[PDB]
DNA sequence: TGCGGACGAGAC
DNA sequence: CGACGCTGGACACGAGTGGCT
DNA sequence: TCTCGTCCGCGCCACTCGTGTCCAGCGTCG
């Protein structure tokens, strides 16, 4: 039996909205620490890890580890039912397969209980090692989403070269060639407009832009995105989920 | 047995009975043959079906053949045990799986793999998948392994004919079709009853297995070029043809060619070099379809440089060289040289010779060449008798049917659209004894031969000169009763036989054959049969379109029926002139 | 000779837009005192009833009944470009003359008149009689629209499950089963957001969620919608119309 | 190289949005006086005229006239990436195969740079009608719903003629509407292109429509007194 | 190869 | 609320493949 | 306008399917 109440239900709503496109069926690990996704897209080009720590969840309960294979499109449809305001506790069936999500309005008049098919998927863990990364970049999330959209209009692939001066996103295509570069602003106010970069070595990689646009769908979760890039190591874009957990997208470098 | 397996089994039996063709194979390929014979009837039927079908993976769902068995999984299992059929497990190539996938399924896979266009052209999606397969996974291998797995799961059970046994059977078909599956032979072959002849095989067209494999490669190259021509992919055609010419040049001094040079002319048309010369002729055809005409005339000069491959078509190449170098190129003095060589060439005959002559007289009359005088000299003179022209106004029915009706008005009630099959039919009927005659070497190889290989080759007259000359004189000086008996004898004895000369449906009844033979008379039939017996290739076409006769009058009118946009062909000009020279009354009918 | 003046042409705009997709090639049976409409759906499985009081319009003066041949899509594009604040007046001559509508914005800087021909029409006049309903529930129109648009994805049918304590819309489908419950409001404000259940006996009938979704299109017209349920009786989807009329959707469970 | 820096590049974005929908290919003629973009619509009925002056742009360098034929379908997407407050500059060398634009956000932290590949006599209109563009957009959309052609008349009348029904709208002077009414006007125009013209409205608060009998109509849009956007209507 | 359409090019 | 943009079912092609006794 | 010459598509047909276009329910954002 697994139970976890979330006051900020918009967190889970935007989580499922971000994850819907990449994964259609993913495994939701159940542990005292929290829920861990650790599933990858159908193309195997990209990988997403969703560690949602139990600290954020209120009244967190987990008798034993549960696989919770959830069809993420169906869960996205079910969560779209929820009001952004409504709290959501996920009541796992004791032994059967019916994730129950109940959404309750703050006004407490309306309660909305739904069950899920909760299918079973072949368990598979990538277990990527925690390789230290060079040229870590920290930039606003909306900015990165906009860069991905613009370059997706321009070209099919994006190449990223990072220096201590800045990080440069460039795409070349049939209709044109384009490049966008950002530099550490070091703003005094620093309401997450900071473009702070720590550099260790010059690293340049080329990445697919379809999956990168799919990564931008996690924008409402966090105002900031951290890009960490080391040569021959897949890009890491991470979204801190409201100080409750973290969602990270990995993307293997394009070869050409 | 159904028709397709019956055709296949007749082809296999005919090739197997040949000892030389069996020597041409390796022991393993004979193993494929004996395994093919070691199958159930449904197995053979399904193998022939899949063989006639294109060599691509075919879904088990789409394989629905009612005549073999309602459920064909046992048959596919038996064939894949025998080796001929490859199941989905041996489908480790991504491009093959993607091509096997249907457009809806490929669109579904594309969405799953997050392709650029989940909807679009099938080829574009396949190319995009091939691009995605080469990328790296986040495992840091191959991403295409997952693409392969998902595409195979989506395609479902699929089968494909193995290329080894397919090559064996394609080579068997080629060896059979040398003497001559094509649709005309795919169906009815079991029912077609061929003429009686004694098989005499003294000379070997192919020496080693490699020679037959090389011939098959050349034939496949020619077939691919011809298919590209038919489908209009002219640039792909040239690239295949150019490769083919490169291959032909690479094998220039191969020792097997030295004996191909010594094969007789009628057998030399079944060699690797012959098919490469035909490929070079198709190369000239594409060069001509393409804007380029300089490389075209260069290749015509190269082909013309050899007397030893394809001399029967030197008229075509001579006319094409003259035409290209005159109309398409400004220079005319080398045109004059080419024409004066062409009329000198003994191989140019009966219509292309007239075309070269007409080009020569045009140049002589044209003010452009009026300065040159060498053209006028040594120009052989063969003036062509003008033909009477009659114009008929009338009008949905075929034009020649309108001409038939018109001549029905002026008498001539009995009339058949021969289109040249009528005179070939009478030629076969009156000369079946010598066309199929025994004692000529290497001209009957298999029992499934519609025509002796000497036919359509100059050697047909030479090989049978005594008998052919004697019978041709006999037909010339013959009464009507004798000709009627002679035609009826072969219509009875060889009734239902298959000859490239005799079309049985051409004459509605044997009585019409008797009447037409009586009306044409002795000398006319003698002349037509003499012109068909010698150099049949250049005289088989252009015969008058309509033969008409009044039963009471015993008078005929070999009438060429041309529409308003139609013209007299060179072969037609020659044949009208020859028939006029024979005492026949011919006239061109124009119907507007 | 029928004249109608509607202070808020937006009311008739939403009426026609919401009722547009439900019934095609419908009929009009406007009375000498007020506007009354009723037609079966294009699939003839549901029913819609419209009523517009004469006194609601600023002016209203009509002489005889008329068929008033209607192409509701044509009327829809007519009420397009009509401002929400715009004043709309409908005047029509006799003998099925083209219905001419005049839209005058309160700014009065611009005024526009559009007339659409009445198309051949036939009046079948089913006239389904009115009857009492075992449970009537007053819920906000927006809440009901959201409830229906929500159960649409997860279910094809909606179980009303009304009770004195509250109501619970339950849906079962491929992606699990869902139930949203609205209790008795028990709210001091007595607002339109409150949900009140007037019922004498519990009832349970499943209704076509598709046609309910068709019904929710009238959400803009009414702050709250009363739903009336009786056993083996088509449910009533009633939307108040600015006190000027009442619109009801009749769907047989 | 030729540079046209635009401090408020939003209006450039908007005119590009209009012209991508209307015209397919066009060539930006650069003269030291300014940048003029007039070309022929892919459709026979209308042609369009965009005028930009050198003084309006912050920077204006032009030594050689370049046509710079550019497929506006691609160029609109290129300019779409620019923000509303983004500063838009166009740089093109006299021997440049591709025109280049650079986007700098107001905070100046982000810099963007994309390079994209490059390939009617005046008649005095006696009567002129000016109406709020949003308004004219509304008449265009409504009468395109009703029908396909509109007949315009003077005292401000737009009449809708469709097989469904008839529609008239009247505008009176009082955001401001002014009609000269120098001659009576009965000019009919196809509404398809009229609604293609409507897309241009976010650019100008007021639209100008001047009628002269059997004389082509022009929907001129005043671009903040910086330039003008003339779409030339050929009456049916 | 062997046909039926079409075109252009010259003669008129 | 709505003007506007977008990607997904539906339908007539044009092409390919196959059965042709 | 007429004629003469040259080039170009041509297995069979009927069944299923790729393809392009079309209309429209849904989603956006101001």
Numbering used by the authors:
A (entry chain F): 1 to 256
B (entry chain A): 372 to 511, 517 to 556, 571 to 785, 811 to 1007
C (entry chain G): 1 to 253
D (entry chain H): 1 to 119, 128 to 163, 167 to 185, 193 to 254
Paper text:
FAN1 (FANCD2-FANCI-associated nuclease 1) is a DNA structure-dependent nuclease ubiquitously expressed in the central nervous system and peripheral tissues that plays a role in resolving interstrand crosslinks at replication forks. It possesses both 5′ flap endonuclease and 5′-3′ exonuclease activities, allowing it to process DNA structures that arise during replication stress and repair pathways. FAN1 comprises a DNA-binding SAF-A/B, Acinus and PIAS (SAP) domain, a tetratricopeptide repeat (TPR) domain that mediates dimerization and protein-protein interactions, a virus-type replication-repair nuclease module (VRR) containing the catalytic site, and an unstructured N-terminal region. PCNA is a homotrimeric ring-shaped DNA clamp that encircles double-stranded DNA after being loaded by replication factor C (RFC).
To examine the role of PCNA on FAN1 activation, we solved the cryo-EM structures of a PCNA–FAN1–DNA complex. In contrast, this region remained unresolved in our previous structure of the FAN1–DNA complex, highlighting the critical role of PCNA in stabilizing FAN1. With this cryo-EM density map, we observed a direct interaction between R507 in FAN1 and D232 in PCNA. The salt bridge between R507 of FAN1 and D232 of PCNA stabilizes the FAN1-PCNA interface (left). Additional structural comparisons between the FAN1–DNA and FAN1–PCNA–DNA complexes revealed that the angle of the 5′ flap double-stranded DNA substrate remains fixed at 68°, and no significant conformational changes were observed in FAN1 between the two complexes. F Overall structural comparison between FAN1–PCNA–DNA (gray) and FAN1–DNA (black) complexes reveals no significant conformational changes in FAN1 upon binding to PCNA.
